[PDB]
């Protein structure tokens, strides 16, 4: 399949949609919602890019690269000007409610949500009323909880059900009240619910066991083991 | 609440123990005769390293008038100086340079870092840089600073004053005891821990 | 379109001239943010393309610059010839006004180029120190040894396999066998430094400890009875190892090591990095930012003008106004400390802008350092350097011309004093410096010792006019830009928006990423011409950070200029360069 | 050389003469350090303190931010949480010979709780004094900012401030409410 990002021609696989094709090739597209272990589901709305029908066409329209195939013959652009305002916007509503809460968040310097928000160049904020608060839940001795920082993406959801089997782990509520976590208070039963932490984008699904003795990614030794 | 040192030419060559202070009384006011002339005139050997050598000749000018202390002869020769003042980077190529220099003063003699680079190094942790003066030779006063302002200098020259007025050194190298004591002074960190902990408001920084 | 815009300069008259004399295909043009038209020259037709340069109807007169590069460890090489390493050459024309970046690539075994110093002079230094730091050999040097590090040392500083902290190697240790080794090291010895030697050419030492403010180094002096037959300068005494630290630190947090590089400098060292940084991550700084950086630059160029003026006079003898032009320094300091906070390296330019707003009342403190300058800078001529003493020990001390000024690259008020009006701020405008008004003195033609003490104290005066205009006309608006990538973002935007916190955060922790690129940016600074050539790859950190100080170029030119004079004329050299060991260095 | 030069230098050595006795009848300029207390600008980049909110409790939160915004790398602390969920400093420690007092700690804080003070008298004698821990640089106050507090801006619940109590936030709605 022959795409053409920005009127630059790749060679990519038919078989997979645009945002993992674009990733592979070492192009940049924000992205929360999609994950390569679980799908595409378009939710997040935030890998807009502009289609174009033909290589002559000016107007194109805005699509999304997880839902969108790429096909042979493939036109596309991430930096068009509408399609970057666009995601700007999108990390902009996703940026309304959220909590002023980086510096005591474990998953600052290691968040997905803060990679996206510097990537997509929002910096100035012009909301000016209240964000929503969510009352946060026990989910026992290895995940923390913390639902402010949600931001609707529907990945911990997605893993825990569709993937690992889970069943105590589940979306409630409604238009922007969406709940994320257990019906009540107590123990996650999945023997893999400890992934969570890293599947969740932002610091809602923590790592309570690093916690305790926390430091940020940036100040750990790392080595590869078994 | 004395240190011990004699020396016999890695360095530095000496080995220092922890000792009682020893102090006739004519003996005592004739030692601190000898140190009120020791510290109250003290000639630095002048030195030039980097910027910290720029703040100590700006503390040698007039606006701060270092001469007050009787500090200002500024020697170029390491034989009539009593004080090395590393005011600046121990480059590699220059830490030879200055080993020499200090070996080349007489007794007795004195150590100032000024700075962070002669202190630990400071910012220029790399390659071609001695991560700190007091890795080859012995420091009496350390500066924090990058640089010390030249108060600073003046401040860290009362305090290598206070120190040089309590310590015991042999009158003559016929009689007494040659060993070198020097005083295992209060640290001026938990001297102003009083005094810096209860400090409440501070001006704004957005005024003069 | 913005001056900080990719450009590949095609429309530049030197490369048509290049196609039409050596062909198409012969070379390859590269599009940078540098503002240069950079070319990548085949290695074998350089000094060819250098001949041709040379002997152009307006030529490039002076190689501004030369060294190398590591292209191992970088990625994003699009549209570039294959190398491991590369050798670049800043060539100057100034009767065109305009500047041409020729690189040569290399291979990793095969690191050998044909030197260049058969066109330019200052290609000795320059090649010595890509030897030293890259492992690069030139074919034909006179004399291809170390100049920063000592004779004895093992690897290249500045290759990307070398590492760069002193607490990955082991901690220093002095013991007694090592203080003679290296004691050992530091002797001289007259057939290894190329004084091809009368049975009275007696030989002199000068430093290496320097008793005088600008660093501690070395000059080995050739000597028959008192004239100075040869001399070579020994450097590399205060090397700091800054471009390898720019390397291992984050943009925003070099800004630091970019304040000691000319340590009388600082706001003036700090601003042609800040902005190469904003070339590089397509920042224009608003008016205000321009006005505020113009201002704090002129006020350190007073600084150390007042410093050198000061030294020169001392150096001559007469030791009081010292004490009076640091006095003014303590004026200046006083006006500096309330702006920034800190005396000799504020570390006060930001990317986008400056680190605070102006305190309330610095138009006040600015307004008595104004009425005090004059009066005492007066009484400074008339106390001083108008004494025929004074006169007697600088003039006709160490003279050259144009010629000599532009074959050694030699900028400043050394260059100045040829008669050659060659200012950055007049002649490649930036920081908003078209908006002030002020001259540019020239000499006569001759580079004396006086004469160039005497330009630092007309471009002393110019720059209490350009306070003055900075005093009359600040505008009122932003101390930072609205630039994503201004880093800090304003400080109360980031104490209570999560969005600018984010910014903040990622921004002083793991780094701002500048998307990869190369830029360029040459000031006028205290001492000649600085400029950062900055090459990023993409991260938050610097691949390449190349600072080329005019001190090098005048501590090159030495030999020529001081050969046949006297030790004392070696001297008041010295005092009349305005150089530092740390521009030098670095 | 000539008589008239000879003449001319004599004169300019009489003047120079005259102007350095004239500069002899003028005004002290030095500041009589130590019995003058310097002065020091409010935003001198001098000893670096820890400060308070407010409230009385210490402003740090334990992020590292200025330990990994510091060029030099002097900066080691250590993040421990309250019962009720609050972060702090296990501890606190600034090797001062190492720090090129340059601020970027300072504007690094975003609960501005490590600050640069206008003091620069920090001699010492042992280089193993100069390293200042959370007892020699935590203050009673709030230093140079006296009203700020992260606290009262941040989503997590800590005592005396629970979920929605914070500034720009609203009452958390439960998913079981009867309103649509
Ligand atoms: C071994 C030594 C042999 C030589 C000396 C023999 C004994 C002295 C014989 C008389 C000397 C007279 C010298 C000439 C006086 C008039 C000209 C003059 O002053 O020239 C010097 C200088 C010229 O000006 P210029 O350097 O061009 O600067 C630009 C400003 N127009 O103008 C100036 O600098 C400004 C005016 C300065 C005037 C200075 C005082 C002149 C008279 C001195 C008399 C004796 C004083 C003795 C000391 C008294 C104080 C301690
Ligand atoms: S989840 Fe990410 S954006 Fe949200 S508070 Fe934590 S670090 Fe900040
Ligand atoms: S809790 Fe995390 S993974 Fe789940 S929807 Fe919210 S942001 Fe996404
Ligand atoms: S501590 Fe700072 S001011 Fe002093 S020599 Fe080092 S770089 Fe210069
Ligand atoms: S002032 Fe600079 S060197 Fe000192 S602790 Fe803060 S960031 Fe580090
Ligand atoms: S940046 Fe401020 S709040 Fe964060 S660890 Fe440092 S002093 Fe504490
Ligand atoms: S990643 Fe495509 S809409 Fe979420």
Redesign the interface.
Known sequence: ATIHVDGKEYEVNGADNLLEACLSLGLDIPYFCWHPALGSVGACRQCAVKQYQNAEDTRGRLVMSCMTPASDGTFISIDDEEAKQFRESVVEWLMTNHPHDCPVCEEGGNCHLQDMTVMTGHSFRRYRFTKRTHRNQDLGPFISHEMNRCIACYRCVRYYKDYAGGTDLGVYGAHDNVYFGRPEDGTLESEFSGNLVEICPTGVFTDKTHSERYNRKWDMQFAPSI | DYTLTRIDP??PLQKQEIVTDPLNVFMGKLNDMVNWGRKNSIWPY??????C???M??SF?????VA?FGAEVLR?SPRQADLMVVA??C???????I???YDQMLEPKWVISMG?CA??????????????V???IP???????????P??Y???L??LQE?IGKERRPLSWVVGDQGVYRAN?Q????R??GE????????????? | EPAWQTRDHLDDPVIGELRNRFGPDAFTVQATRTGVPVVWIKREQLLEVGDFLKKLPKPYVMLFDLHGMDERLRTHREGLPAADFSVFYHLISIDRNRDIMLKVALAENDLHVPTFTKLFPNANWYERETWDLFGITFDGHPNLRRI???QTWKGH?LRKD??????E?S?????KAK?DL??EA?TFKPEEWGMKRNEDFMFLNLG?????????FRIVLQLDGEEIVDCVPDI??????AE??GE?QSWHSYI??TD?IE??GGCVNEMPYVLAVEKLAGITVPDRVNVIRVMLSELFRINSHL?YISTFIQDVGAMTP???A??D??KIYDLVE?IT?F???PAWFRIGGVA??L????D??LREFLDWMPKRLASYEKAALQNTILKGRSQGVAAYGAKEALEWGTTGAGLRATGIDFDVRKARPYSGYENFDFEIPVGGGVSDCYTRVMLKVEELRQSLRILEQCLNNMPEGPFKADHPLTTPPPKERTLQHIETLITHFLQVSWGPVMPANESFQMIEATKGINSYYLTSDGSTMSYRTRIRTPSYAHLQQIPAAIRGSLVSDLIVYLGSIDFVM?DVDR | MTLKELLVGFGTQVRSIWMIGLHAFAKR??????EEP?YL???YRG?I?LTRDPDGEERCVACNLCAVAC???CISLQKAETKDGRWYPEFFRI????????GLCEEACPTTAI?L???????????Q??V?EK??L?????????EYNFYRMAGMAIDGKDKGEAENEAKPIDVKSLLP
Request: aromatic share 12%; net charge positive.
């Open positions: 890695r360095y002048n030195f030039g390293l980097s910027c050598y720029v703040e000749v700006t000018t007039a606006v701060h008038d007050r170029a600046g980077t480059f590699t190529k220059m830490a030879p340079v080993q020499r220099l962070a202190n630990s190094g400071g910012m220029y942790d790399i390659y071609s840089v001695v991560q700190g007091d890795k080859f420091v009496d006063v350390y500066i924090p600073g990058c640089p010390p302002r108060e600073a003046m401040q860290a009362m305090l120190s002074m640290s001026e960190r938990e102003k821990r810096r902990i209860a400090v409440t408001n501070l001006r704004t920084p957005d005024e003069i | 920063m590090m000592p500083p070398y590492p760069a902290r002193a607490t190697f901690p220093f240790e002095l013991t203080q290296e004691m530091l290496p400890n320097h008793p005088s403010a600008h660093g501690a590399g005494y205060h090397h700091r190892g390898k630290m291992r630091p090591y000691r340590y009388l410093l010292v004490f009076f640091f006095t320094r303590q309330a906070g005396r000799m390296h605070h707003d305190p309330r009342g610095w006040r403190l740390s | 300029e030095t500041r009589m350090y130590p310097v600008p409010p935003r000893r303190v060029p030099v790398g090797n001062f010979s190492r720090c090129i007092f340059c600050q003070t206008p003091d620069f008298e920090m001699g010492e004698y042992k280089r004094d100069l200042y007892e020699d935590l203050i009673s106050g709030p230093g140079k900012y006296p």
